[PDB]
Tab-separated table of C-alpha atoms in Angstrom:
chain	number	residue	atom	x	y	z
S	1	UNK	CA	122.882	113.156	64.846
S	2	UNK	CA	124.708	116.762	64.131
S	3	UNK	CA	124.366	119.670	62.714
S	4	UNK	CA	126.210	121.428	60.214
S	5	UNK	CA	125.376	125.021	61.143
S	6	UNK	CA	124.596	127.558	64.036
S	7	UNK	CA	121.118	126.467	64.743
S	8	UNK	CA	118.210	128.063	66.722
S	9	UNK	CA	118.170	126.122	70.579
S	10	UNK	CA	114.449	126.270	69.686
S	11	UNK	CA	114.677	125.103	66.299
S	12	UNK	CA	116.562	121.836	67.621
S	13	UNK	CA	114.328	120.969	70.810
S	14	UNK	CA	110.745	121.620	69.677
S	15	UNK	CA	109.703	121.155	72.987
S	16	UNK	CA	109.717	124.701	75.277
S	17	UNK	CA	110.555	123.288	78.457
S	18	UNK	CA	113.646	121.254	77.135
S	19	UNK	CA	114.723	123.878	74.499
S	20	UNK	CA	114.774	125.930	77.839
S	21	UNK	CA	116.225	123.376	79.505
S	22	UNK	CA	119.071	123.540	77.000
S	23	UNK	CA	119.508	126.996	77.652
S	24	UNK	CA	119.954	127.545	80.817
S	25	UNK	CA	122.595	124.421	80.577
S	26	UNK	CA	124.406	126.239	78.129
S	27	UNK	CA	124.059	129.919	79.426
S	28	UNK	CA	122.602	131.545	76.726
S	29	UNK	CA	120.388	134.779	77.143
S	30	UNK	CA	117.556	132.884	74.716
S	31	UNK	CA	116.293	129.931	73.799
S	32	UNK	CA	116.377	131.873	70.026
S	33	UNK	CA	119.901	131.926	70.534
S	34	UNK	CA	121.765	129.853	67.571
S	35	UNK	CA	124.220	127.193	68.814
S	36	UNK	CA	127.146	125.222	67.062
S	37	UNK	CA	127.382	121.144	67.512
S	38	UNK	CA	130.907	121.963	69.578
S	39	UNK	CA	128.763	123.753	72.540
S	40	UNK	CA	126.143	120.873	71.834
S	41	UNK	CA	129.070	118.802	72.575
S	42	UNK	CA	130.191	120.433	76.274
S	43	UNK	CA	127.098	118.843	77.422
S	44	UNK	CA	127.946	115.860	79.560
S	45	UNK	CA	125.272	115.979	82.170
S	46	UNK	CA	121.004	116.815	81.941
S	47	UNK	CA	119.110	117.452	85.063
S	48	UNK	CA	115.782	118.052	84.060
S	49	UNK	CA	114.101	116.634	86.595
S	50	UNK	CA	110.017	118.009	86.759
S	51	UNK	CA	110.638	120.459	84.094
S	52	UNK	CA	107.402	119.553	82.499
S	53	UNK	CA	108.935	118.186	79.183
S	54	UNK	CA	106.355	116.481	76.284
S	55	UNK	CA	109.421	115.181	74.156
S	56	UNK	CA	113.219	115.522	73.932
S	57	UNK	CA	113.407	115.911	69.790
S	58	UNK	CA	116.945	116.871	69.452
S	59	UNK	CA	118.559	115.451	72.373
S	60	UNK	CA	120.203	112.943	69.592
S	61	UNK	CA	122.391	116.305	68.651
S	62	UNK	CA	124.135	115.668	72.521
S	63	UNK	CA	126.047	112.629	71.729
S	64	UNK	CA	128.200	113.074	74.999
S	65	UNK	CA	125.640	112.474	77.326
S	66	UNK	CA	126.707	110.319	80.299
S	67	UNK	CA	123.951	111.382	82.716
S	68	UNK	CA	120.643	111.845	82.466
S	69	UNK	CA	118.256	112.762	84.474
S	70	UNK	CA	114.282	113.264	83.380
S	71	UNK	CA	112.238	112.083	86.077
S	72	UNK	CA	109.008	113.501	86.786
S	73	UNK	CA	107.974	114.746	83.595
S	74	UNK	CA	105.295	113.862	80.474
S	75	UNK	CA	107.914	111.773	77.901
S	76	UNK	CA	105.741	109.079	76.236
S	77	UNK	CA	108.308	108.459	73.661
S	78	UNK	CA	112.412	107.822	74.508
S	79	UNK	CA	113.481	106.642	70.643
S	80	UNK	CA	115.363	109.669	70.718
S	81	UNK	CA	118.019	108.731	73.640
S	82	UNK	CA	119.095	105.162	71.564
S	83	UNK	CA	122.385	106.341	70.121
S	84	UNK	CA	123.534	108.350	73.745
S	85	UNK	CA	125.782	105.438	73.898
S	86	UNK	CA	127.683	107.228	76.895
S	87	UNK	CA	124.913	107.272	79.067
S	88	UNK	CA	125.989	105.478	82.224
S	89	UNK	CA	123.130	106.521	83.910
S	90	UNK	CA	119.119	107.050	83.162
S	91	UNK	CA	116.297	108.246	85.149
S	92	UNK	CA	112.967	108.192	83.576
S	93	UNK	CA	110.799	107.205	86.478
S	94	UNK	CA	107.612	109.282	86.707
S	95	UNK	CA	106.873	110.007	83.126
S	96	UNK	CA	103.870	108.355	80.991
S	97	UNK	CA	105.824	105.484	78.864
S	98	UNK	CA	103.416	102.976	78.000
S	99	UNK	CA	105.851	100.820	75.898
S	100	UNK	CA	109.244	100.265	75.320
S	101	UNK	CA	110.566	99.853	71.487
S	102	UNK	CA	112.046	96.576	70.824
S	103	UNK	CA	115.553	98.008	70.684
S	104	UNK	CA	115.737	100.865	72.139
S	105	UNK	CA	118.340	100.442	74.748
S	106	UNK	CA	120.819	98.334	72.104
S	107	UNK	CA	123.569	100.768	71.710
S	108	UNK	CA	123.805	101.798	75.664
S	109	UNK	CA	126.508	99.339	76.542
S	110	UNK	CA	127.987	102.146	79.106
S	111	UNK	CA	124.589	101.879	81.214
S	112	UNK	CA	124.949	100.776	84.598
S	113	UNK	CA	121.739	102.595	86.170
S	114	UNK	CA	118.842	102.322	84.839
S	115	UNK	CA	115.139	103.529	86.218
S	116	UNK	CA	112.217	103.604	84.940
S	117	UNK	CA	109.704	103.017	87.922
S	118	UNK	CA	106.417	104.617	88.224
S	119	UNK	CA	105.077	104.806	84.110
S	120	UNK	CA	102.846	102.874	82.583
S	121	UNK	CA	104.651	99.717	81.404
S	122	UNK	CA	101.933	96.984	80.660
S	123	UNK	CA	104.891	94.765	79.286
S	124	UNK	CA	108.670	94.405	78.194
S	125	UNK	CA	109.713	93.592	74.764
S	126	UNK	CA	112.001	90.305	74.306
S	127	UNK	CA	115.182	91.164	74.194
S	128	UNK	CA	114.262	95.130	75.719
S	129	UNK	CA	117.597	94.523	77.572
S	130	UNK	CA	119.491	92.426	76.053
S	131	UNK	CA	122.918	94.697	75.433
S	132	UNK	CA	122.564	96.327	78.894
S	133	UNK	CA	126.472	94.509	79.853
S	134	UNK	CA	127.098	97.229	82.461
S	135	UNK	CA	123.640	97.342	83.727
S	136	UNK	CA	123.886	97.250	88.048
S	137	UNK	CA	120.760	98.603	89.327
S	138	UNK	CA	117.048	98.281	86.900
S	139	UNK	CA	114.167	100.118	88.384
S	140	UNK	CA	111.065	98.423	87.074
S	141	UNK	CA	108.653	99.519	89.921
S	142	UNK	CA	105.563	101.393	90.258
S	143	UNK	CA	104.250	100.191	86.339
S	144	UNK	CA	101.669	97.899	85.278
S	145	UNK	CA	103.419	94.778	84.381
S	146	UNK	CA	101.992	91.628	84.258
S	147	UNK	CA	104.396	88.841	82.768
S	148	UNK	CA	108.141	89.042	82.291
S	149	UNK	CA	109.093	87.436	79.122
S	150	UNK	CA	111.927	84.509	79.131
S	151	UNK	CA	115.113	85.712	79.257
S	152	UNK	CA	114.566	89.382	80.102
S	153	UNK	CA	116.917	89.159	81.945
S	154	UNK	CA	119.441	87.045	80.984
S	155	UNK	CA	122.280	89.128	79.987
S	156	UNK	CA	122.503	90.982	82.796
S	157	UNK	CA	125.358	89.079	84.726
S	158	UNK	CA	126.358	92.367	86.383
S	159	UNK	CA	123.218	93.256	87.941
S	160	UNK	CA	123.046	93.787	91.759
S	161	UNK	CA	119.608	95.237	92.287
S	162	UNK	CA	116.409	94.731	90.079
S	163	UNK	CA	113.267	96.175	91.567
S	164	UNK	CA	109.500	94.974	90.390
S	165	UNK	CA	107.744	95.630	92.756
S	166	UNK	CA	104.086	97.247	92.829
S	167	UNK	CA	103.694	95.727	88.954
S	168	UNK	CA	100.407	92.719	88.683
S	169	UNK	CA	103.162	90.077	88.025
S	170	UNK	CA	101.127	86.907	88.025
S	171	UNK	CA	104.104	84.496	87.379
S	172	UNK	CA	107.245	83.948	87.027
S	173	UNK	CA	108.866	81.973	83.929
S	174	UNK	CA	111.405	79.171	84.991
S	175	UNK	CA	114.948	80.579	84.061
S	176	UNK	CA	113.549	84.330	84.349
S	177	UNK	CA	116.465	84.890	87.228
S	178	UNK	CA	118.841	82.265	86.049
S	179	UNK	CA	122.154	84.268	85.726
S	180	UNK	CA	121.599	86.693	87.721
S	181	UNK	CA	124.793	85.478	90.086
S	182	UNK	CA	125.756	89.049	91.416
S	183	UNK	CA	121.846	90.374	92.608
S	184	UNK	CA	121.982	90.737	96.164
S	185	UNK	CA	118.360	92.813	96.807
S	186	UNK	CA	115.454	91.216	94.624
S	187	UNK	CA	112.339	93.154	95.290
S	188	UNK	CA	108.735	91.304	93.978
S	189	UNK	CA	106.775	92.591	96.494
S	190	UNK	CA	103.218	94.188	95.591
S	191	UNK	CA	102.624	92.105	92.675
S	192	UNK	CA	99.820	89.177	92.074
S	193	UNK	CA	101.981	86.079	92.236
S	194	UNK	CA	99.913	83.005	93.219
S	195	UNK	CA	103.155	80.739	92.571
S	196	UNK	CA	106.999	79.928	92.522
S	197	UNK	CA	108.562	77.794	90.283
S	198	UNK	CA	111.026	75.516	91.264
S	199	UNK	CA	114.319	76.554	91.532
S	200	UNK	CA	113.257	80.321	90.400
S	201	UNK	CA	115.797	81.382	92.525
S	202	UNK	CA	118.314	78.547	92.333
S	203	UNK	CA	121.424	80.549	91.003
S	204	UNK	CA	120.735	83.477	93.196
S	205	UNK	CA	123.849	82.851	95.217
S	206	UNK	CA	124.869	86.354	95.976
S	207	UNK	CA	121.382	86.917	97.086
S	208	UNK	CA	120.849	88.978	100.435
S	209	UNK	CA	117.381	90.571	100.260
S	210	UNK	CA	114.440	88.726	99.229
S	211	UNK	CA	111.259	90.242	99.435
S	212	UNK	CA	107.935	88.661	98.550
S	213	UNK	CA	105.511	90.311	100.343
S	214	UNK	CA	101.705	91.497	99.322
S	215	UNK	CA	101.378	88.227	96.929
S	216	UNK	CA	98.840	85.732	96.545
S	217	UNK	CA	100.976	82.827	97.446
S	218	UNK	CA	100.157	79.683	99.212
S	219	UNK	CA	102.095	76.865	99.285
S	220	UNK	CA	105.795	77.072	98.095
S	221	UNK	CA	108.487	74.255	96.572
S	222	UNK	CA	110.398	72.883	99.293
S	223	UNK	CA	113.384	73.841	97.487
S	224	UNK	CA	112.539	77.308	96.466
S	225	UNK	CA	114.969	78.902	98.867
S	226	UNK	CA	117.591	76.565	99.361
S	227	UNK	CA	120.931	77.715	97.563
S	228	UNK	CA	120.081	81.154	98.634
S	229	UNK	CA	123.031	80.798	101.065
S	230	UNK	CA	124.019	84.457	101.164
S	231	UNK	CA	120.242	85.956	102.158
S	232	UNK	CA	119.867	87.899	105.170
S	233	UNK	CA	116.036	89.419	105.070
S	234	UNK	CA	113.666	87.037	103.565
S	235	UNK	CA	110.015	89.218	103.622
S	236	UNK	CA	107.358	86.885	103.026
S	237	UNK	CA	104.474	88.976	104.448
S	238	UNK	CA	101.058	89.759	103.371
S	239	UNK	CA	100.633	86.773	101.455
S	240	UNK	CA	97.991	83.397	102.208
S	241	UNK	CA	100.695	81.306	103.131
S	242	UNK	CA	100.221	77.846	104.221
S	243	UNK	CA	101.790	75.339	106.964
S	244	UNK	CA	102.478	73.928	103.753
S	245	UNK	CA	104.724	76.542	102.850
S	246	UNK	CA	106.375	76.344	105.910
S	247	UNK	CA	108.498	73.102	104.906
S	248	UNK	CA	110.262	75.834	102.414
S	249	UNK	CA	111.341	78.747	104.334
S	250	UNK	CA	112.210	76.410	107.615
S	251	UNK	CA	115.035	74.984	105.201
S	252	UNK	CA	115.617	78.655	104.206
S	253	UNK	CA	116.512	79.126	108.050
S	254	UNK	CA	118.693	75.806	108.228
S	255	UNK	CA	121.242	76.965	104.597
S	256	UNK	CA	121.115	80.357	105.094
S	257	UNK	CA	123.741	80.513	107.765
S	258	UNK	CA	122.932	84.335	108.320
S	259	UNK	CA	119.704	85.244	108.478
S	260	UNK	CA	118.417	87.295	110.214
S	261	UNK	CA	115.347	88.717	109.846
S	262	UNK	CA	112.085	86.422	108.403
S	263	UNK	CA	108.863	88.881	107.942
S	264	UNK	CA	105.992	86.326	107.717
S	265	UNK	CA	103.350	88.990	109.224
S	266	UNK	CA	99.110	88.486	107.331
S	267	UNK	CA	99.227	84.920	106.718
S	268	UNK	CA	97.407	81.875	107.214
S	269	UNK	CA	99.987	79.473	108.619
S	270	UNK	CA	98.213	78.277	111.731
S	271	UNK	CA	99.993	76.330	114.769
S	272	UNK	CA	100.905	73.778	112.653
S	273	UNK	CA	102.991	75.755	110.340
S	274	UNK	CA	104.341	77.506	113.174
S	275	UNK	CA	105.512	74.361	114.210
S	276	UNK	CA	107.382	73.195	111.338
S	277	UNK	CA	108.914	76.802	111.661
S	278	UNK	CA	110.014	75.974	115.508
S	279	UNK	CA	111.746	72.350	114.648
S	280	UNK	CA	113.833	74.391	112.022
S	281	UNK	CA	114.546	76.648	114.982
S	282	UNK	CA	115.160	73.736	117.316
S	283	UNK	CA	118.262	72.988	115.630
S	284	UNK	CA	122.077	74.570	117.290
S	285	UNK	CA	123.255	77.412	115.099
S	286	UNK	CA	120.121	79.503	114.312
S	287	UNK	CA	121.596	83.271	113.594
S	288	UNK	CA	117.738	84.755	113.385
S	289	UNK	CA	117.704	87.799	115.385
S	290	UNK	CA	113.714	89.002	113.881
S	291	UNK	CA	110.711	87.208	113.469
S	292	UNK	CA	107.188	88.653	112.661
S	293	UNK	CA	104.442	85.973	113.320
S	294	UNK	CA	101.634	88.785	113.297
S	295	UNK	CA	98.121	87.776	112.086
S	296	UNK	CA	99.422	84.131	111.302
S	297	UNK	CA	96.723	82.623	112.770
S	298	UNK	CA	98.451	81.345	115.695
S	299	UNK	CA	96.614	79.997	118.758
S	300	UNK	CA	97.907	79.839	122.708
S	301	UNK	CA	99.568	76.121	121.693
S	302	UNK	CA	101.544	77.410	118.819
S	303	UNK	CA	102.543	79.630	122.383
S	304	UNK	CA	104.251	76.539	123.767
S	305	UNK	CA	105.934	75.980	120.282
S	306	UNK	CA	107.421	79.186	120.167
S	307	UNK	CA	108.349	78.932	123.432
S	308	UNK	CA	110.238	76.029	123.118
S	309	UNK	CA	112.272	77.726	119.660
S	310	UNK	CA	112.971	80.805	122.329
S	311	UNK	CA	114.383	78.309	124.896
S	312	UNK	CA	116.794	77.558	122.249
S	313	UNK	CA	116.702	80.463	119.559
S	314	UNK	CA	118.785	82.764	121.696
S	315	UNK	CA	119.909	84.297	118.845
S	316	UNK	CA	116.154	86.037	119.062
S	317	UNK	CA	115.930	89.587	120.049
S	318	UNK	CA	112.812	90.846	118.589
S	319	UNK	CA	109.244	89.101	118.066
S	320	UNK	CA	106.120	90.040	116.922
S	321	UNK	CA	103.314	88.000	117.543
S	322	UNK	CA	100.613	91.121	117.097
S	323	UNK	CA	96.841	90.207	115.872
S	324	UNK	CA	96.904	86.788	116.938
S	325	UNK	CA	94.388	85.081	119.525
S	326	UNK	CA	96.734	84.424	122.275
S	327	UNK	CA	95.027	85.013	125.771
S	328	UNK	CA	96.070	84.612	128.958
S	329	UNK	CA	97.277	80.800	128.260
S	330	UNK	CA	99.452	82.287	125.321
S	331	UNK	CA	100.724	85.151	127.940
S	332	UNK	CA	101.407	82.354	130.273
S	333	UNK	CA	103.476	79.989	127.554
S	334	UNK	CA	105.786	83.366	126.307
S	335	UNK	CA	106.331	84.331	130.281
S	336	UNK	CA	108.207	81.221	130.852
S	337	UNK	CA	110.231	81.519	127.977
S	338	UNK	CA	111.073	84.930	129.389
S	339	UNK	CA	112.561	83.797	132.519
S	340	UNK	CA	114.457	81.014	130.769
S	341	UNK	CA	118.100	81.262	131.886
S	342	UNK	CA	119.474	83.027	128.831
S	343	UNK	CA	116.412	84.308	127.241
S	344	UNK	CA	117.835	87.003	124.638
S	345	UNK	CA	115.066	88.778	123.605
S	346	UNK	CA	114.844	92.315	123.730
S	347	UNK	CA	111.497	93.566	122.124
S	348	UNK	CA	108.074	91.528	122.032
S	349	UNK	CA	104.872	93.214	120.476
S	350	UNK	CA	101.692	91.513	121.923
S	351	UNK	CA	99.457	94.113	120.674
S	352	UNK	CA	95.874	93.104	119.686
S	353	UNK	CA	96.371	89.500	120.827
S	354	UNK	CA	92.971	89.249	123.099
S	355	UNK	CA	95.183	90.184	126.379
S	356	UNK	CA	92.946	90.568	129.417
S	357	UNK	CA	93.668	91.226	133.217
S	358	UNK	CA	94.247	87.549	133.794
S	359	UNK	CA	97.147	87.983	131.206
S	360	UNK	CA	98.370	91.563	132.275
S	361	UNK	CA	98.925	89.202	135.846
S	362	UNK	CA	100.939	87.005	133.755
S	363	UNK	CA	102.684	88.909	132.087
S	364	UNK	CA	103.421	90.777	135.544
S	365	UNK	CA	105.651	88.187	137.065
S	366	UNK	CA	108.224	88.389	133.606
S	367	UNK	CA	107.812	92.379	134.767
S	368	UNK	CA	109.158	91.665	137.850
S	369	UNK	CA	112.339	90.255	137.668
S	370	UNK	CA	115.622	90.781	135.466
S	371	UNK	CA	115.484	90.200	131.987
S	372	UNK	CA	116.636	90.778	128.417
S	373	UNK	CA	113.439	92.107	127.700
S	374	UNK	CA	113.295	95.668	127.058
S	375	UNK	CA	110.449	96.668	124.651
S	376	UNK	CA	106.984	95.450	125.323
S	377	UNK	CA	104.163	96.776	123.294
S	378	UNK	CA	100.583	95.709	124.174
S	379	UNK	CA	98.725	98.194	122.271
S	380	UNK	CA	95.017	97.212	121.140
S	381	UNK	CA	94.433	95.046	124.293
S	382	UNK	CA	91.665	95.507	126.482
S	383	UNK	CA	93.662	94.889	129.321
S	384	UNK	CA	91.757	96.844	131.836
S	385	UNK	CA	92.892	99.082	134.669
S	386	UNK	CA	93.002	96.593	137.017
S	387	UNK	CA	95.145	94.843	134.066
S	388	UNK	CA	97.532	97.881	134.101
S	389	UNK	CA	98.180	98.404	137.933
S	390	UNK	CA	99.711	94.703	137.907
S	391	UNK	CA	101.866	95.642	135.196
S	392	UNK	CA	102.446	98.939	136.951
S	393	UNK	CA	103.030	96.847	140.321
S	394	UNK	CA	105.918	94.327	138.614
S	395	UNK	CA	107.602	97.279	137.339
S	396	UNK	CA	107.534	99.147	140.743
S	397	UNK	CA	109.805	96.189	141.901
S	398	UNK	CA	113.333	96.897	141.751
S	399	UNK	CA	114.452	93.748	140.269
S	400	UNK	CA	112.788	95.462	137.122
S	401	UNK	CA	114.467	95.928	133.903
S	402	UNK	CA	111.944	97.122	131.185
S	403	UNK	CA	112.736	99.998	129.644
S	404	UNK	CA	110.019	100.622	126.750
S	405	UNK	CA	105.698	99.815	127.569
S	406	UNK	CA	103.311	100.655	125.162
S	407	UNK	CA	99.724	100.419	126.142
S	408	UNK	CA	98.726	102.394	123.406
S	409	UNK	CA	94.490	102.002	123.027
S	410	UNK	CA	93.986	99.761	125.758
S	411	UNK	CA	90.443	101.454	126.698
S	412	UNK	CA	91.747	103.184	129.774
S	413	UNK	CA	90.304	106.113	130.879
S	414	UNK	CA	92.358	109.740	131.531
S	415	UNK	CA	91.990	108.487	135.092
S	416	UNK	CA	94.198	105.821	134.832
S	417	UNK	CA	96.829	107.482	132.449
S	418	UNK	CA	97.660	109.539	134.485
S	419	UNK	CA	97.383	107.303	137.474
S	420	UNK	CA	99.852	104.879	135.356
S	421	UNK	CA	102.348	107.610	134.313
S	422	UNK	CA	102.404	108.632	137.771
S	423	UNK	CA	103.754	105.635	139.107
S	424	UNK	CA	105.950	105.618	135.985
S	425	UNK	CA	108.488	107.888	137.834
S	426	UNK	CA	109.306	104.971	140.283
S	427	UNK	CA	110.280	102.574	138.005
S	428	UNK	CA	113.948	103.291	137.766
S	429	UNK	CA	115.080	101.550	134.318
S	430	UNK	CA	111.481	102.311	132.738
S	431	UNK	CA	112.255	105.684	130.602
S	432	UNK	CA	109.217	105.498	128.084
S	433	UNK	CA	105.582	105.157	128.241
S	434	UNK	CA	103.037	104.979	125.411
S	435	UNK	CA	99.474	105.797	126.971
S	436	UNK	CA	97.803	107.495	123.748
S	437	UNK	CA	94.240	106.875	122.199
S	438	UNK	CA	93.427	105.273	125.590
S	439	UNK	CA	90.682	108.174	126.083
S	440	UNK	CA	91.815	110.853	123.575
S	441	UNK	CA	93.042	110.215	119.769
């Protein structure tokens, strides 16, 4: 829309904060000021971020809009922004949209970034996006949806990031990710998925970031990651995963050549799906460099496992195998794959794994001798003083290489903190010590 005469700012943006908005953009002393469509017409660019706007009525008289920015504010209606067909880029995030009109976004053919994460979005129209050519990155986070309608998607061939997480997704439709060739981050995570179709992410070739984490899932197709050949970070955490599921994302680490980090950290896999994990590692040309096994349920034989996929993982620099019940026989199974000729790890966190003295003496002769390890954390261990000093002893040796010990809340007394970062000094290649909440948090 235009208008024919010199109009009142506030006459044309009912709103006070935008009219004001409009103002200051402009330069004019007040927002009674009268303005001509020509000046509405300079205006190529809104920041209006947090400016407390209700509505922007007469933001359809700024046709040259290319950028837009209204995050933070109280919109619960956009109708007005559908013919801004130069807007290349929208920010709506943080404002109180409950629904979306059907067409809406029809006319914005220039729109490569679009975001509106954090509203109230209970569900997307058919067809909400279905003009969106140039569309790159969609912002869907932070809202309340819980289905996505076949073929929301499927005209965005350009799109390289689409973000839905923190929604209550509770499925996925079939083809809801079909041509989505050029996405390389895809970010469910937060949502209440109890399920993957087959083949969900089949076309997803370009894909580097997966993440899936705090879901409901359990088991998993076989398939379901299998022509993701480009993914690098597949997050999988926080979920109820299976050993059955474990048949799926070991054939995610044999076709995806590089990948290199596998977040599988609150899940219920057990030894036996840790297994199937360490046969896919078992195989020559791993490239996985991170691996979180926290809280997997794990026991001190799926510690000889693992040991036997870092005998032959070297790729393997850091590994977390916190809030597990490992022991001193689980200590004792990691210790020899430490002084394997050509371990490559780097950083191992033990923390809360049930360590006692009798594993601290374990763990003592890895301590002792040159290795790739340099970051130990075995935080939330009731190790023990006695527990400590044999750590303290192995380190004391010269042969030691360590560099990072955390022994964060290991129910030592100021007595022995101090006693321990005493000795500290000694230990030539050790340069930092974690001794908090031992005695005083």
């Amino acid at each position: 829309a235009t208008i024919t005469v010199s109009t009142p700012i506030k006459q044309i943006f009912p709103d006070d904060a935008f009219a004001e908005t409009i103002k200051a953009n402009l330069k004019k002393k007040s927002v009674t000021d009268a303005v001509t469509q020509n000046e509405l017409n300079s205006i190529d660019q809104i920041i209006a971020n947090n400016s407390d706007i209700k509505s922007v009525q007469g933001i359809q008289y700024l046709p040259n809009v290319r950028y837009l920015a209204l995050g933070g504010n109280k919109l619960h209606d956009i109708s007005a922004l559908k013919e801004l067909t130069n807007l290349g880029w929208l920010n709506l995030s943080n404002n109180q949209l409950e629904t979306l009109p059907q067409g809406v976004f029809e006319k914005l053919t220039n729109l490569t970034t679009l975001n509106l994460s954090n509203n109230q979005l209970t569900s997307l129209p058919q067809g909400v996006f279905e003009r969106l050519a140039s569309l790159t990155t969609l912002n869907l986070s932070n809202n309340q949806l819980t289905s996505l309608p076949q073929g929301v998607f499927e005209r965005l061939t350009n799109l390289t990031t689409l973000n839905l997480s923190n929604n209550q997704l509770t499925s996925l439709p079939q083809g809801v990710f079909e041509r989505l060739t050029n996405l390389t981050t895809l970010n469910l995570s937060n949502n209440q998925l109890t399920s993957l179709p087959q083949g969900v992410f089949e076309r997803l070739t370009s894909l580097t970031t997966l993440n899936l984490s705090n879901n409901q899932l359990t088991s998993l197709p076989d398939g379901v990651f299998e022509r993701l050949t480009n993914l690098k970070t597949l997050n999988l955490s926080n979920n109820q995963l299976t050993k059955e599921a474990c048949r799926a994302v070991a054939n995610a680490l044999k076709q995806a050549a590089s990948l290199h980090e596998l977040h599988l950290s609150n899940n219920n896999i057990g030894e036996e799906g840790a297994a199937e994990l360490v046969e896919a590692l078992l195989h020559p040309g791993s490239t996985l460099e991170t691996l979180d096994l926290s809280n997997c349920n794990l026991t001190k034989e799926a510690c000889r496992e693992i040991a036997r996929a870092l005998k032959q993982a070297t790729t393997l620099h850091e590994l977390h195998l916190s809030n597990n019940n490992i022991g001193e026989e689980g200590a004792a199974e990691l210790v020899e794959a430490l002084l394997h000729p050509g371990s490559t790890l780097e950083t191992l966190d033990l923390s809360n794994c049930n360590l006692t003295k009798e594993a601290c003496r374990e763990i003592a002769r890895a301590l002792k001798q040159a290795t790739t390890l340099h970051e130990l954390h075995l935080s939330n261990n009731n190790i023990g003083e006695e527990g400590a000093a044999e750590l303290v002893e192995a380190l004391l040796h010269p042969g030691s290489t360590l560099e990072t010990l955390d022994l964060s809340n290991c129910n030592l007394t100021k007595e022995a903190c101090r006693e321990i970062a005493r000795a500290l000094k000694q230990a030539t290649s050790l340069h930092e010590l974690h001794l908090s909440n031992n005695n005083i948090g």
